[PDB]
Amino acid sequence: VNSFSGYLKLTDNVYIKNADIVEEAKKVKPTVVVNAANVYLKHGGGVAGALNKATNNAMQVESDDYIATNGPLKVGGSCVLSGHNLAKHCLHVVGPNVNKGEDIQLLKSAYENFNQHEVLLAPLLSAGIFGADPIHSLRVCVDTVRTNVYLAVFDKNLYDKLVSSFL
Numbered sequence: 001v002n003s004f005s006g007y008l009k010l011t012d013n014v015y016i017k018n019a020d021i022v023e024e025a026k027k028v029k030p031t032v033v034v035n036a037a038n039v040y041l042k043h044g045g046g047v048a049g050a051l052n053k054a055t056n057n058a059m060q061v062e063s064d065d066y067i068a069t070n071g072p073l074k075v076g077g078s079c080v081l082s083g084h085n086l087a088k089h090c091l092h093v094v095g096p097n098v099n100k101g102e103d104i105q106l107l108k109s110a111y112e113n114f115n116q117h118e119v120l121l122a123p124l125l126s127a128g129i130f131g132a133d134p135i136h137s138l139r140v141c142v143d144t145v146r147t148n149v150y151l152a153v154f155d156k157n158l159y160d161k162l163v164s165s166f167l
């Protein structure tokens with residue numbers, strides 16, 4: 001049993017809810033919250049901007065030190081950093097950004113990072129401002145992630161469409 005509440009069960013391991021990921025993290029304090037980051041860990045907008053704002057910019061300060069030491073992530077890659085006030089850990093995962101022309105096949109590689117963690121609170125990778133079709137992102141998630149993932153979808157009209165269209 002875990003603390004996640006109000007989710008619809010899609011599969012053995014994937015759950016979904018219409019929720020603001022920031023508000024969900026603040027309530028649950030999950031072991032892992034996933035950030036939809038860019039390779040530079042520049043948390044300017046969408047999930048990354050909202051998460052970073054909720055940490056009072058501490059996420060960005062930590063991320064700048066990570067990049068200064070290690071250089072940029074790979075598209076499809078990840079790093080584990082602090083969850084600050086939101087979670088124990090933040091898994092920063094880089095899905096491909098369609099609005100930059102990145103290979104959508106890298107979305108499966110991005111979701112494979114989730115398999116290193118038993119339970120996660122996450123957004124749909126590569127969707128929203130990254131340009132991908134969220135229906136596609138949910139299908140890749142279900143077909144890639146084997147660990148227990150609790151998906152938070154901010155957009156109400158999109159949540160209802162993801163559920164209604166789910167195969």
Ligand SMILES: Cc1c(O)cccc1C(=O)O
Nearest residue numbers: 124127128134153154155
């Ligand atoms: C996945 C997504 C969209 O495709 C569009 C707007 C918000 C979101 C979100 O849940 O963050």
